[PDB]
């Protein structure tokens, strides 16, 4: 449900509004440098940028708390809503790299690659040292420094065995953290797992919209939730979340 | 008795209010993560944050002190009722991760995993490793940070052989006390020993209940209390205390 | 487009203005000194510095940002500026090296090693000592610890095969940053492979130009760019970016 | 549905208030006496009495009224809420000796005897004497006379055929009142049927719960029954019903 | 003279006050709770108490000081207070123990077990595992966690050879401190040597009077003391210090 | 020369005045505990404590500074000043121990054992586990924790090979400083290695005599002295230092 | 050219005046300890404190400034000042323990131990422990804790291989910085590389000159440097820095 918000920062965010939900990220520009000294010509390359398009009824997952909790810590409403935020704001990054797209997306395994790449075996017993040369192959234009997204199995697989440093992992660090990877921090969720690393760079794979974060419907109008003044806080993930690229 | 109030902060805590003693934690809410779209399931997640029982006579311990030293020292009542308070909110703790409810359970060993289980032999020799991969199991869903309830003597050997740190536990600390375990601090109490470390999230197994803090009834009217003068503050753990799995 | 300024502060530069952009580096120069007690002998201090021409408009390289972008975020144009920049200032420190200048230069492979000569084959799987042994040759007169231009590739080639370190290139460090090669810190960059390292004296290849960093012109007065609010944030390469000898 | 009110009267009840229902059933009792002249001697006496635990929603049943009979008559209101209250309050005598408890039990065939035991096949045709003796083990320790709940037809069966009176049953009587039994009175209801006799001290079968009768909400709120005016008096059985032992 | 104060505190202490001095202890007592769901069965808790008497003169031992130290270091007065008040509490606690009540008492070997027995031979080098066994027989209605007194030669015997741990005692620590010994802190005094571990409960063997500490007397008037300005400051253990079963 | 002042502090110190320096030591003390009952006796022990003797000239050991540097700076005659004291109380304490009284001693080996004994092998490579018996040997009558004195060479023998700890000494610290041994903390000078550990009780072997701290005089009148303006401080050590037993 | 000040703080430094420069340390005072009592034993130790004496030409290393630079950034010569300071206040401190001083000296590898002796081979990668055991042995007479100078590059290499921690140097930092060695904080510089480690005291190795830091000697009166604007400022080393032993 809940994960660490990493992804979302370093990857493109924007809103478009119509019926659906609607987002741009820096993806291509080629762009014509034309020449110059005597004399131009045409900006003959073009403005690129994509922007996509998403239709599905928001991300839901339902959240339900009573009344006399409710009423007894006023806290534990604002700490939910704070939580759930996080949840489909993290189910964002995980299905705007690769994961659960409100339409329905391929079940998928490792963290993309350049961009989800088939599952292949490491050598070492942990997953290791394409972490490395990954966001270094995004050295090259591109601007290096992505946070590889592990599972804290690995993560202690990474601080039992070989790695970049066989006690820890490239950085010595809790799980679900801001912590460390290759050349920059590390990010540690559930569901994906390091394989060979990621370089989200940060358009092909990732792209975040929202109207607003994961919509928190709460509705005390059900025919049980009325009398039990049990609350029905719902997570409904309002904007949106998708990959253009696997 | 007495012992460390640490699980108690971190586990849930409410107040109905029979003749009895009743809580809520946040259980195993079946949150059906009915994605719906369109169009929906009537959510599979029937509230499941759940609401038990317990009814017994209440945690019983008497502690009896004499008028002497009641009137030579006026502090040593309210110490004693600020010890005791303690030593039923511990047996809270631990009756409400695994020791003595009011209504008899089975004695057990160690400390849950994600729940009790059965006790197993550990390679080193001290409890060990199973600690980081625990609130790490604790990181995928869950919040991660667990104070794991490990015996001063576990805690001792830790401080003496392979560990986290091979020096102290994963943490060098004294014992019972606000210390350090793995991903966050250590709890040191006797009678739940460490073996494969705890997860407490938080509802499954743990979960708090208070009318008030454990009833401190001194009685100074016993057919021997009354002449002596000397006291019988009888620790009846008002409230009470329980797992709703082992 | 985007590289490390890392080149460009080792690398002298000038202003001087005309219709050109223009530029001094402190080239070969007669520090005698003669022995003395009594009497001295002749200090035929001539210093050989230079002063370039070069006419050919500003290295350009537009970028493109929609209206809608502009508007939901302020920042993203301050950081294209604040990215741009450097992108030409580091196709600068390139075409100050080896890469391309304003004016059609030859397509080259490595980094000048005194300067730019031949790519020769190297006996190590990765590229190696010669390394160490160029800002050695950077010993006499010469100040020694210069940043070899390497790429990213060819670093983890380094992390993984034999170097000055078996593990890690010269130093154990990330791609694209101020890190560590012979003697001093690294550069790593693409276009800039390393072969026989950089001896980057400081002059005779390098020479830095500029009234002002890559001139950002954004025209939203195009024929398509102004409907739709698309900005034309232009980079034109403002000063220059030249090597003397290659 | 409705039934006698008989078994719930000779019952232990008892109102404990939290979240879920509660009760108090006294689990036996011992009770001595007193000489005089002089010398006044002390009673030894333990008055058992056990409390135990039912969580779940509360038994649904739900009845819906037009708003033009509601109108017509306004006694039918009042006549199902006397009516809808009496039905669980006797689905709770029911679910107090064996029936529908609010969480699922065994669905089980005849009255308890000493408590719940195997149907056995009777000699005479209807079910018979084991009547009288079951009361008459109630003439040692415990007081004797127990309702003993009967179906209409076993009762009309005992009227035709050899019973204590082979014409009427234990006594002449019509079914579902307050009639005559071995003893005592006897019961009347269906799902309830006589084998061997009841001797329903009061206990270790039967304990009665209420914070109030079965909770009578009446919705004029459905998506279908406002416009109709149609009422959605749902009987959901407030306090509760249960057997400690079957 | 001076030992560690730990028994002292463990042990129960009080003050009647005669010619003679006094004190009480909680001896061996029933606390009869009997069963319930129903129904208190007699609580026939006769709480065996006990108070006792002893008659001599505050156990003596003087300490010199002479008027220059006195003048010089202030100091050196309070401290050797602060000393012999320990001395003669821990001469206390031995006398409590098993040692030298002021009345005379047999001359005694090691550690009370359950209390005072004879002295046998141990099977491994240094006193050993009948430690956790003691407080293991302390934990029926028994409290557990003992501070069992051992000498320091056995501690580094127990250091050396096989114990709880072969290496240190039960736990690795310095003597004459707060240490650690079977669940609990260990003491190490001379006079006491640890053969079968104590279960101090706390009455028996043990109990506390003082009206004050061991009372210091410092008489500057002595026939000899007068002039040299010499200190006659005299511990005489005010309040007592006796055994009630050795 | 200079070492550190840790010794002298434990150690008991004094000041009688003739002539020569003189102190007294809590030596011995028999003291007569007598008894009661009814029912005393004469104090027939005596009061003890050592006062002792002992005639030289101050040790001396100059310390020449140049009136250039004691006008540049005028800190460095207070610095020497406060040098030279601990210098001549550290040259107090090694005298007060085991090594140069200002009367010609034996130039002896280790620190003292219960008393200066003979040098033996010790079977680890650096000076061992005799430590911890040592000031345990001190926890009888004896007050334990005392400084046992080791040379820096060893505190890195005990850091490299088996100690208490095979890392660091008994406590992993910096040499020359108030750090940790067995049971308290560890002192480090030359002279004084490190054999058999120190129970510096307190008196036998140690006593401190000053009039004042080691005498200061400075002598600008010397033949050489006066007209270079080079200062004369000489370290007289006033009061004295001296071991009643080696 | 430049280091860091660390070596000069913990230096002693003076300033005689005549021709040449000057300089005082507390060097090998022959502090005869002449214990004497009587009979004058005339200090056997003539006041040895050094002040020694240096001629040569004044250390040269210019820096030529172009007077466009300088209008542009009125800075660059205050820093280029407060740069070439401690160029040569740290080829004081070089030329103070072993490097260049203006009068030539023999070109030398390590850092002084005691003093300069003959560089070995040392057992790890990098060089090692001999380190703690140096300002250890200076932990005899004299106070410990020195600047262990090494170069980035053993820095880097004891960052990687074996040392006092296996990961950083004795203490993890960067390098060419108030960082950590042994006891106290290490410094790193290119030249002087870490061999067996320093007990700079203090003066044995060490002792600073100065009139003034290094004499900047600002020329605009050159043939060339007059009317290009460009500057002659000739760092000449002002004062002085010399070994008296190597």
Redesign the interface.
């Known amino acids: ?2 994960a660490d918000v990493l992804i979302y920062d370093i990857e493109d ?4 509004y119509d019926v659906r939900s609607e987002y ?1 990220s820096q993806l291509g ?1 080629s ?7 005597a004399v131009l010509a045409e ?1 003959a ?1 073009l ?3 994509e ?1 996509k398009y998403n239709e ?2 928001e ?8 009344e ?2 409710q009423n ?1 810590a006023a806290l534990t409403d604002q700490v939910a809503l704070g939580k759930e935020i996080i949840a489909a704001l993290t189910k964002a990054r995980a299905a705007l790299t690769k994961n ?1 797209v ?3 997306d391929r079940v998928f395994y490792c963290d993309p690659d350049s961009y989800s790449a088939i599952l292949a075996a490491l050598m070492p017993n942990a997953a290791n ?1 394409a972490a ?2 990954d ?3 995004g ?7 992505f946070e590889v997204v592990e599972v ?2 690995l ?2 697989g990474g ?2 065995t070989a790695r970049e440093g066989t006690t820890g992992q490239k950085h010595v660090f ?3 953290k801001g912590e460390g990877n ?3 921090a590390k990010d ?1 969720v ?1 569901g994906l797992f390091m394989h060979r690393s990621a370089v989200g760079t940060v358009k092909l794979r990732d792209l975040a919209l929202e109207r607003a974060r994961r919509a928190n419907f709460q509705a005390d109008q059900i025919i ?2 009325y ?2 003044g ?1 609350g029905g806080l719902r997570p409904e993930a309002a904007g949106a979340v998708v990959f253009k690229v696997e």
């Open positions: 449900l809940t965010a924007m809103n478009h741009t520009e762009l014509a440098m034309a020449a110059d000294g900006i390359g403005c690129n940028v922007s599905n009824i991300g839901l997952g339902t959240a339900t708390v009573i006399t909790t007894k659960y409100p339409a329905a040292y490395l040369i966001p270094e192959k050295s090259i234009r591109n601007v290096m420094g804290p199995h993560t202690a601080a039992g809790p799980a679900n290759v050349k920059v540690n559930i049980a939730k009398a039990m049990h």
